């Protein structure tokens, strides 16, 4: 499992793999680990597959009620704070959750990191998963705030490919989204076996 | 626990305990407020001072946050407990969504607190 | 029940043409000690169903009490309705599962035989809440010993008469007397038909010991 | 567990007058590959190979103890070793560590040298030989390889269809395993020549 | 002490088609080293267009079926229509997560037709995560069946092989052959093979014998 | 695993199945479980399959050494005494459950040896996982001094009870009949269970698999 | 499992059941627990099956070599002293409930008891095994000084019949043996 | 695990902490802030495990802001620190005890500057200087070596400069950057974010 | 510790020892284990001392309130049903070995047994306690159908005398009680 | 726990390690040396617990120096590395197994440069580049990002420069200094002790 997210001048780029294992047995290769909370928010999946699927679908319920009462959409910092409080009431009972929250805000881009233990931090770049440490090194090299859009795609696309190459629990296909001004736009979804021929030559 | 319906309907369609409480407002001292385009100005009249009292414990303009002021009329004993319940809510908004409280939000909290309180059991 | 104190042993049961026959012995063990040697482990529920049980015997007298009251109160309604054997089998399955979920199970294993509306019913109920139906059942070590003897007849001959079924049980009760340390040579045979529920007396097996002279 | 520390998979399959063996290429420590060229099939004379899978220490340890005992055999006797004879030799080596056991499961495949007849067998980690007539498998992803071989094996197969069957048996099963992969090498032997091929697998 | 779980075996299989859906399972109930019965299929017909298969701890499988069938009636008595296949999957994920800290030991696969008459397969974990797939296999012999359907249905790891969609005829014999291979190597894979076929006209059923070790 | 033996009016009939189950997966479909000891004594093995192989070869090596020195026929009590003295020495760390049977000068003799070293002479024994199922066929239908046609029918019936009722058993039934003058070892006595025929043609052709690198090396 | 030995003036009388269990399954249904060592010396064994079969063979080895060397029939006290030395030195590794009884020309019938500790004592009558606890009260009241041989065969038949019926680990058939100067009379009894 | 420091002078309190938000072996964020305001002259510096440092310290922050609105004046640093000690001690013998280590810094117009010390067992200590984390073992010995009760705030900064350079010599963690505050009669003031260039 | 009850035609006969131990020290040397509930209904208790004293007081509370309400002497089966409901509901918290015996006008003498599980059964004679295992074989052979009262006083005296002498936890003095239609005759016996 | 790296080129092997000898929380020595010569063209780089890295690696050193005196020529890097694997594997199932992680670097005049990889379970691996320690998780992904089999030794140094600057950005340990060797046909050569000024 390997997810990453980084913000730059033209919004936020989110990428992930698609392999979900069960012990040494691979259950599936087509697991969508970047679930779509809203047309204006995104959330990742790391750790508990059903723990991240439930509590972020429960978050999408809560953000909709906020819009119907206040007649504007919730900010990214407020949305992460609601998620961090719901998880905290089951602290010690054994929830596995390491997600990230992305989205455009009135203050510009937004990128937050929520653990199941109660961590809530902002930042510029993040990488979550079993093969996350394989993603930091290749992402720290080619990162700039002033990247172009086609260059930011090929950065985050190859960075997942270097993590799936070393990690045994990561693989499948490379999903890739782009959080923009108005909302998120799905970029691509490339197979690793197709990228292996691309990046070798 | 005292369970009794206080506010009920009239045979023609009124809530008598509501509109009796509106006449308790109609003999409290006058509070006037206008808004400018850059500076709001509101000021109560009839301080009704008797020159032997502390002038600050008789004030009827308080603040709920740094940005939200509040004046009232009616009877003062019911006022300063609605205010103290509004101070908790506008503070609990900041532990939630990070911005300070919009002035429309704190009116919806006071108005919805006041409606459901004309609906419960054993409460004027 | 965390630890069963006084336990029973294997209970057999098999269908035949027009009824179910169930046999079980009359011993309540306590560890390796045979204390209570005249107890009855078969309850005759009202007229078309019948219950035997293994496991903890104090929990069996509880279910003997609860199922007794559920039959007494219905029959004084005058509805013309009674519980079918699979209605009791469905109730008792829910009673097991709703009690292991509170981590406080009834240490039993129960066989429900019944003949209602022209056909036979034979149901299994586990401590964990596992229930199924079969033409022949066996609990305990009878699931290892007597159960292969039941299936090798029912595969070569699917339908059995009452005398063929009653003969086939007493052979299986004989084998459990030889190869089980918790058995006892005193059992009773219960049988439902269209006529009703009948329980026979403390029958006994006849043993063979001719191989003891072989050094 | 212990066998899941490094992964690995070895398959052998019997044909008409020929026999093929295949293995993966990954070397790693529980999540983390190190190299993709780790040797797991070792030659023991002409037309007779052995495959090893299990703990990466005992793969390199048994393959050197066995070669130590093999060259002493082929010099004290003037002939090459029969495939049935080596099965008793390997089973003796593993049973000496009855209480200190090596964590590997060998697979032996080769042709009998005089009458060119194929031979396959497999052993557990304390030396119980099991000869078959269709296929033997060993490694972590064992159950995925039974579903391949029980569904694809035919009795009398030329070396062309023997290669295509064992290739599809390895590529589909090892892709379903997590700790095994990174390439598959296939040795297919026969009485006149021998063939080493590497397959185009997922480097994922 | 009293362990509240046991493993009762079972192996289920679902394949989504273009206008059909095929759900199959064995009929063996067995724990330990013994056999309880040789007739206990896992094909449960929910609606005329939705069939679920439930493997694992058998006490939970009896309980979870009866919880589901009550809520299909409560939906209809509150909304005047039957549930769709995607609505059953969204309901079941809340049911399984509702016992997050004492879970059901059940693997679930829902097969059936969607609103457009196409196949749909929803596979579950024992916690309540799910996704829509084209073919899944769960239970005891799930690790044997999933590689074989990648090669045939998924057309994976092959070169210069055409990509024809699976017909109803081809999918029957492909199901019937993959259980014969699983019956040889798995001790839990049973004796009779119940196959339930969901089409636009109803649900057909079919029984195929196997070996009986 | 299901092994059994009986003593009829002239000799001894032994029987077994052919399955080795590693974990819960069938590893071998034709594993032979009846072993050679002498030209008159055989043994069936159960338990750890590696411990029973290396034990039954050690004793059969010593009895070939013993009988070739004395120049006469081995006895069944010698193989009993060698086995239970060495299993007691290893304190039960060697898991080996054996059914020992043979016809020496004194007649037919059937033993059962437990992996701690306890033995017993009995007219009929069953060992293995599905031994309780096979005992019930013996316990219902044994009669002293049967003919060998009645004995072979009895043992194959008892092994079949361990086939259709035990998970870790069930394939072709082996038998062996030892008498004073005849040794009929025969592995496929009956085939109770087959494999079903394939229906869908899965056949691939040459060129459907991508190859990175090929090498050809000739031999002679 | 349930073993018993009673002496009378001319000799001793032994008895045991025939059930051998493995937890709760009846492995051996009929079992000879009366093991000969010499022509007039028996032992009846209980506890672990693999231990007491191995110990009784080594004592028969050492006592048979001892008597052929002196050229003289061995003493019952000599045979009971040999079980003591093996059961005490290996007391951390054995589960032995041996009762040694037999006739001797110098002293007549003797009965010795070696329990799981490794001690040794002579008794008028001995009793051991798992099922022996349920007939302590019977064997105390019913025992009478100065019995004949035929009364002791009755006295060991009634006592073993009660422990077999009450205990679950005992059962099977009753094996008896009467050792005198004249010889050994073995019989198999049921009832 | 991570470090903060409490030098207190005659009419000021000099506090500083690190900026590193850690993880398993990596550092997620390099410019984290351990500093929480409650009033114009009271800070709060919290150290501990993941969830409790964030939510306890902002639970206190909403109770101090509420006290100012209900009354019109602020808490003293003595009373604000002593309100916190009651909240750990009551929640200590509970199903969920908070595991945080903290020290509070405050100025008052009556008793001047003040520094308090707490732990995860809620024991107060009025101290002239204190520290938490594993760096406290390295750095307390420099600090009582050179402490004068009459120390000026210019040389108190370079004492803190000396107290952190030793922490990047014989301490195995990374810790490159340090954020510094100062509290006086004029309130909170941000000082220079002192750091050491790893280029 | 060692308790026993035998019925005859006119009534029942009870008996118990008097030793109460605390591990291996004799705390109470003489002890009354025969607890009255009503005028014709006794119980003899074993197991935990603190449990069976607390249970026997609550049953006496509930049965005395029950009989004064019907204005009718209670049944022995009614009193045994009350111990069953407390020993089964609190079976995870009690160690009770209660034997309920007594005379009734409608049915005569009855003997009921409630062991530590919480079941209930009627017997011709009951026996319980730690020392009761050593006189199972005696009480099976010696028991004879159709005894008088004086034979049952002999039959419970000889049986308790054997368990007291053989077990270490039993001992002290023998307490007896004969419940008939006429009344209760209690005596303290030694020998 | 501590780091070393193995870039191997066409006619050279570039190795580097850290210089920190650690303790409980402090660092005892800042210029430790993890580098052990055996021949003029064979090095050894050992990582592990306290006693075993020193004494095992000099046990091997006295056996390689002995082989040169008994015969007049040196071991190949293949044979020298494969002699070490026999010594861990034989001492593995013992009363005292050594717990060391190592990688060996060597040049030969027949097969050119060579790099081998081992662990505390004695598994060999002929690798083009390798690393030990927790820094290997951070730094292998940069290294296969930019590796060419035909890489010149001037740009291989600045690849190592890039591979260590990321290690001082997202790794919680200190690790300021790194000692660098290079092996070629002319033998061992010391390169610049590259480091990062913490002033």
Q: Which of G30, G167, G171 minimises the CB distance to C212?
A: G30
Tokens of E185: 């190597």
**3-state DSSP assignment of residue I27:** strand
CA E31 from centre of chain? 20
CA distances from G90 to A166, C131, E168, G62, H99 (A): 58, 51, 74, 17, 56
End-to-end CA distance of chain E: 32
DSSP states along A67-133: HHHHSSPPPHHHHHHHHHHHHHTTTTS---B--EEEEEETTEEEEEEE-SSS-EEE-SEEEEETTSH
Chains A and D touch (3+ CB pairs under 8 A): yes
What domains are there in chain D, each with its CATH number?
1-204 (3.60.20.10)
Partner-chain contact E62 C129, CB within 8 Å: yes
- Interface membership of H173 toward J (CB under 8 Å): yes
Buried b (16+ CB within 10 A) or exposed e, J68-81: eeeeeebbbbbebb
DSSP states along A28-77: ES----EE--SSS-EEE--B-HHHHHHHHHHHHHHHHHHHHHHSSPPPHH
Contacts 24+ apart (CB under 8 A), G24-30: G24/C141, G24/C180, G24/C181, G24/C182, G25/C141, G25/C179, G25/C180, G25/C181, G25/F132, G26/C178, G26/C179, G26/C180, G26/C181, G28/F120, G28/F122, G29/C178, G29/C179, G29/C211, G29/G172, G30/C209, G30/C211, G30/C212, G30/G172, G30/G173
**3-state DSSP assignment of residue J130:** coil
Q: Which residues from G are below 8 Å from I166, CB to CB? A: 136-137, 140
Which of H24, H29, H58 is the best substitution to test chain A (most A C-beta atoms within 10 A)? H29
Bridge-based pairing state of the strands F20-22 and F12-16: unpaired
Q: In 3D, which of E116, E130, E136 has the Cα closest to residue E53?
A: E136
Around F78, how many Cα atoms within 13 Å sit in the side-chain half-sphere?
Answer: 20
For residue E115, the 8-state DSSP code is T
Chains C and H touch (3+ CB pairs under 8 A): no
Q: In 3D, which of G45, G2, G5, G44 has the Cα closest to residue G171?
A: G2
- Interface membership of H170 toward B (CB under 8 Å): no
Torsion of CA I114, I119, I124, I125, to 10 degrees: -30
- Interface membership of I120 toward C (CB under 8 Å): yes
Q: Minimal Cα–Cα distance from C19 to chain E, Å?
A: 20
Chains A and F touch (3+ CB pairs under 8 A): no
Which residues, in sequence order, are bridge partners of residue E22? E15, E197
C-beta atoms surrounding H77 within 10 Å: 26
* A1 flagged as catalytic: yes
- Interface membership of C149 toward F (CB under 8 Å): yes
The Cα–Cα gap between F121 and F5 comes to: 12
Q: In 3D, which of D54, D133, D42, D44 has the Cα closest to residue D94?
A: D54
Q: What is the Cα gyration radius of chain H?
A: 17
Tokens of F22: 């590693």
Tokens of F84: 């239970």
The Cα–Cα gap between I116 and A53 comes to: 50
Q: In 3D, which of G43, G20, G16 has the Cα closest to residue G188?
A: G16
Question: By the 8 A CB rule, do I165 and I172 touch?
Answer: no
Instruction: Give all chains having 3 or more CB-to-CB distances under 8 Å with chain B.
Output: A, H
Which residues, in sequence order, are bridge partners of residue I2? I129
Q: Which of H26, H28, H51 minimises the CB distance to A117?
A: H51
Which residues, in sequence order, are bridge partners of residue D136? D12
- Interface membership of F9 toward G (CB under 8 Å): no
Catalytic residue, chosen from F1, F2, F18, F55, is F1
Question: By the 8 A CB rule, do E198 and E20 touch?
Answer: yes
Nearest CA in chain E to A90: E101
Partner-chain contact E184 F170, CB within 8 Å: no
Degrees, nearest 5: CA angle I6-I12-I15 = 60
Which residues, in sequence order, are bridge partners of residue G174? G189
Q: Which helix (H) or strand (E) holds B89?
A: helix B76-95
Torsion of CA C125, C126, C132, C135, to 10 degrees: -70
Alpha helices, DSSP H, located in G71-148: 76-89, 136-142
For residue D99, the 8-state DSSP code is S
| Topology, domain J1-196 | 3.60.20
Partner-chain contact G137 I135, CB within 8 Å: yes
The Cα–Cα gap between A90 and E59 comes to: 28
CA H116 from centre of chain? 9
Tell whether residue A168 is among the known ligand binding residues: no
Partner-chain contact D204 A192, CB within 8 Å: yes
Q: Which helix (H) or strand (E) holds I70?
A: helix I49-70
* Size (chain G), residues: 191
Partner-chain contact I116 C1, CB within 8 Å: no
The Cα–Cα gap between I16 and H177 comes to: 84
The Cα–Cα gap between E201 and E48 comes to: 9
Work out whether the CA dihedral E166, E168, E170, E175 comes out positive or negative. Answer: positive
């Amino acid at each position: 499992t390997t997810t990453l997210a980084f913000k730059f001048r033209h919004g936020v780029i989110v990428a992930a793999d698609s392999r979900a294992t069960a012990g040494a047995y691979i259950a599936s290769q087509t697991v969508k680990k970047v679930i779509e909370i809203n047309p204006y928010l995104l959330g990742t999946m790391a750790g508990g597959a059903a723990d991240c699927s439930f509590w972020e679908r429960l978050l999408a319920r809560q953000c909709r009620i906020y819009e119907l009462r206040n007649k504007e959409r919730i900010s990214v910092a407020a949305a992460s704070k609601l998620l961090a409080n719901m998880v905290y009431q089951y602290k010690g009972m054994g929830l596995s959750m390491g997600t990230m929250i992305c989205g455009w805000d009135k203050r510009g881009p937004g990128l937050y990191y929520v653990d199941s233990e109660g961590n809530r931090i902002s930042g510029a770049t993040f990488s979550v998963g079993s093969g996350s440490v394989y993603a930091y090194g290749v992402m720290d090299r080619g990162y700039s705030y002033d990247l172009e859009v086609e260059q930011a795609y090929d950065l985050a696309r190859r960075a997942i490919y270097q993590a799936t190459y070393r990690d045994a629990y990561s693989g499948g296909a490379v999903n890739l989204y782009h959080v923009r001004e108005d909302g998120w736009i799905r970029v691509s979804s490339d197979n690793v076996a197709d990228l292996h021929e691309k990046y070798s030559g | 626990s005292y369970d009794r319906a206080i506010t009920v309907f009239s045979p023609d369609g009124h809530l008598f305990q509501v509109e009796y409480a509106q006449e308790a407002v109609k003999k409290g001292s006058t509070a006037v407020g206008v808004r400018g385009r850059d500076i709001v100005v509101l000021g109560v009249e009839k301080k009704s001072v008797a020159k032997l009292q502390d002038e600050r414990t008789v004030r009827k303009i308080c603040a709920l946050d740094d940005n939200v002021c509040m004046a009232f009329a009616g009877l003062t004993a019911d006022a300063r407990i609605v205010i103290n319940r509004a101070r908790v809510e506008c503070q609990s908004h900041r532990l939630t969504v990070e911005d300070p409280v919009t002035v429309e939000y704190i009116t919806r909290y006071i108005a919805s607190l006041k409606q459901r309180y004309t609906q419960s059991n054993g409460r004027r | 029940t965390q630890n069963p104190m006084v336990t029973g042993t294997s209970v057999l049961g098999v269908k035949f043409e027009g009824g179910v026959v169930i046999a079980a012995d009359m011993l309540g063990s306590y560890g390796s000690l045979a204390r209570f040697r005249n107890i009855s482990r078969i309850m005759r529920v009202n007229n078309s169903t019948m219950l035997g049980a293994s496991g903890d015997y104090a929990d069996f007298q509880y279910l003997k009490q609860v199922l007794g009251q559920m039959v007494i109160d219905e029959e004084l309604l005058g509805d013309g309705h009674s519980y079918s054997p699979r209605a009791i089998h469905s109730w008792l399955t829910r009673a097991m599962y709703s009690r292991r979920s509170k981590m406080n199970p009834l240490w039993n294993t129960m066989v429900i035989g019944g003949y209602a509306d022209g056909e036979s019913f034979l149901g299994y109920v586990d401590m964990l809440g596992v229930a199924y139906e079969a033409p022949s059942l066996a609990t305990g070590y009878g699931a290892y010993l007597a159960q292969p003897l039941l299936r090798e007849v029912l595969e070569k001959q699917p339908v059995l008469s009452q005398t063929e079924a009653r003969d086939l049980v007493e052979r299986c009760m004989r084998v459990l007397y030889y190869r089980d340390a918790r058995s006892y040579n005193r059992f009773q045979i219960a049988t439902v038909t269209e006529k009703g529920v009948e329980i026979e007396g403390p029958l006994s097996t006849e043993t063979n010991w001719d191989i003891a002279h072989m050094i | 567990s212990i066998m899941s520390y490094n992964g690995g998979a070895v398959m052998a399959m019997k044909g008409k007058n020929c026999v093929a063996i295949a293995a993966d290429r990954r070397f790693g420590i529980q999540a983390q590959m190190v190299t993709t060229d780790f040797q797991k099939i070792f030659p023991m004379g002409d037309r007779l190979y052995i495959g090893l899978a299990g703990l990466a220490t005992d793969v390199q340890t048994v393959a050197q103890r066995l070669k130590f005992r093999l060259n002493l055999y082929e010099l004290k006797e003037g002939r090459q070793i029969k495939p049935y004879t080596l099965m008793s030799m390997v089973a003796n080596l593993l049973y000496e560590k009855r209480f200190g056991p090596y964590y590997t499961e060998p697979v032996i495949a080769g042709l009998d040298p005089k009458t060119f007849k194929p031979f396959i067998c497999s052993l557990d980690l304390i030396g119980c030989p099991m000869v078959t007539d269709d296929f033997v498998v060993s490694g972590t992803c064992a159950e995925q390889m039974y579903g391949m071989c029980e569904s694809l094996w035919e009795p009398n197969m030329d070396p062309d269809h023997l290669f295509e069957t064992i290739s599809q048996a390895m590529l589909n099963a090892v892709d379903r395993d997590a700790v095994s992969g990174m390439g598959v090498i296939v040795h297919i032997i026969e009485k006149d020549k021998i063939t080493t091929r590497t397959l185009k697998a997922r480097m994922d | 002490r009293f362990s509240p779980y046991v493993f009762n075996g079972g192996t289920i299989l679902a394949i989504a088609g273009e206008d059909f859906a095929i759900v199959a399972s064995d009929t063996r109930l067995s724990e330990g080293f013994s056999i309880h019965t040789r007739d206990s299929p896992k094909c449960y017909k929910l609606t005329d267009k939705t069939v679920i298969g439930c493997s694992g701890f058998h006490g939970d499988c009896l309980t979870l079926t009866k919880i589901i069938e009550a809520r299909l009636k409560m939906y209809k008595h509150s909304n005047n229509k039957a549930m769709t296949t995607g609505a059953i999957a969204a309901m079941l994920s809340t049911i399984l997560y509702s016992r997050r800290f004492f879970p059901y030991y059940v693997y679930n696969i829902i097969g059936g037709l969607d609103e457009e008459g196409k196949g749909a397969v929803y596979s579950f974990d024992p916690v309540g995560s799910y996704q829509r797939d084209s073919f899944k296999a769960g239970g005891s012999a799930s690790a044997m069946l999933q590689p074989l359907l990648d090669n045939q249905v998924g057309f994976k790891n092959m070169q210069n092989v055409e990509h024809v969609p699976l017909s109803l005829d081809r999918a029957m014999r492909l199901v019937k052959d993959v259980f014969i291979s699983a019956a040889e190597r798995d001790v839990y894979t049973g004796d009779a093979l119940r196959i339930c076929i969901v089409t636009k006209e109803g649900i057909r059923e079919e029984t195929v014998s196997l070996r009986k070790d | 695993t299901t092994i059994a033996g009986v003593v009829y009016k002239d000799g001894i009939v032994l029987g077994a199945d052919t399955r080795a189950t590693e974990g819960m997966v069938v590893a071998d479909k034709n594993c032979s479980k009846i072993h050679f000891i002498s030209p008159n004594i055989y043994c069936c093995g159960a338990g750890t399959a590696a411990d029973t192989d290396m034990t039954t070869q050690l004793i059969s090596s010593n009895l070939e050494l013993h009988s070739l020195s004395t120049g006469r026929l081995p006895r069944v009590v010698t193989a009993n005494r060698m086995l239970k003295q060495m299993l007691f020495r290893y304190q039960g760390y060697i898991g080996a459950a054996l059914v020992l049977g043979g016809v020496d000068v004194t007649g037919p003799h059937l033993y059962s040896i437990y992996p701690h070293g306890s033995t017993d002479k009995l007219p009929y024994v069953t060992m293995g996982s599905g031994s309780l199922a096979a005992m019930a066929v013996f316990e219902d239908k044994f009669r002293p001094d049967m003919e060998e046609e009645e004995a072979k029918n009895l043992v194959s019936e008892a092994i079949a009870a361990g086939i259709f009722n035990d998970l870790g058993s069930g394939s072709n039934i082996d038998l062996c009949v030892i008498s004073k003058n005849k040794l009929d070892f025969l592995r496929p006595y009956t085939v109770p269970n087959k494999k079903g025929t394939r229906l869908g043609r899965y056949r691939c052709e040459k060129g459907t698999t991508a190859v990175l690198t090929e090498k050809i090396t000739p031999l002679e | 499992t349930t073993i018993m030995a009673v002496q009378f003036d001319g000799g001793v009388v032994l008895g045991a059941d025939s059930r051998t269990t493995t937890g709760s399954y009846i492995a051996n249904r009929v079992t000879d627990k009366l093991t000969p060592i010499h022509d007039r010396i028996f032992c009846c064994r209980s506890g672990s099956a693999a231990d007491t079969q191995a110990v009784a063979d080594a004592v028969t080895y050492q006592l048979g070599f001892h008597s052929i060397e002196l050229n003289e029939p061995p003493l019952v006290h000599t045979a009971a002293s040999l079980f003591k030395e093996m059961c005490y030195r290996y007391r951390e590794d054995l589960m032995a409930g041996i009762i040694i009884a037999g006739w001797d020309p110098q002293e007549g019938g003797q009965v010795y008891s070696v329990p799981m500790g490794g001690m040794m004592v002579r008794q008028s009558f001995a009793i051991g095994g798992s099922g022996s606890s349920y007939i302590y009260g019977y064997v105390d009241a019913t025992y009478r000084e100065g019995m004949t041989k035929e009364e002791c065969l009755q006295f060991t038949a009634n006592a073993l019949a009660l422990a077999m019926e009450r205990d679950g680990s005992s059962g099977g058939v009753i094996r008896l043996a009467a050792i005198a100067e004249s010889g050994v009379e073995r019989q198999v009894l049921l009832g | 695990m991570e470090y903060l420091i409490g030098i207190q002078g005659p009419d000021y309190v000099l506090v500083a902490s690190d900026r590193v938000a850690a993880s398993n072996i990596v550092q997620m964020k390099d410019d984290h802030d351990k500093m929480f305001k409650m009033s114009e002259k009271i800070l709060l510096l919290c150290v501990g495990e993941a969830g409790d440092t964030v939510q306890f310290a902002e639970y206190i922050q909403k109770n101090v802001q509420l006290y100012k609105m209900r009354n019109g004046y602020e808490l003293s640093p003595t009373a604000a620190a002593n309100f916190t000690r009651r909240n750990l001690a009551d929640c200590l013998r509970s199903r969920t005890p908070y595991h945080v280590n903290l020290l509070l810094a405050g100025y008052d117009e009556h008793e001047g500057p003040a520094l308090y010390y707490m732990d995860y067992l809620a024991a107060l200590a009025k101290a002239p200087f204190a520290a938490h984390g594993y760096g406290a073992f390295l750095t307390l010995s420099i600090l009582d070596r050179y402490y004068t009760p009459t120390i000026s705030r210019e040389r108190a900064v370079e004492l803190l400069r000396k107290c952190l350079e030793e922490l990047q010599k014989r301490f195995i963690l990374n810790l490159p950057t340090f954020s510094v505050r100062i509290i006086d009669k004029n309130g909170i003031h941000d000082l220079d974010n002192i750091s050491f260039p790893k280029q």
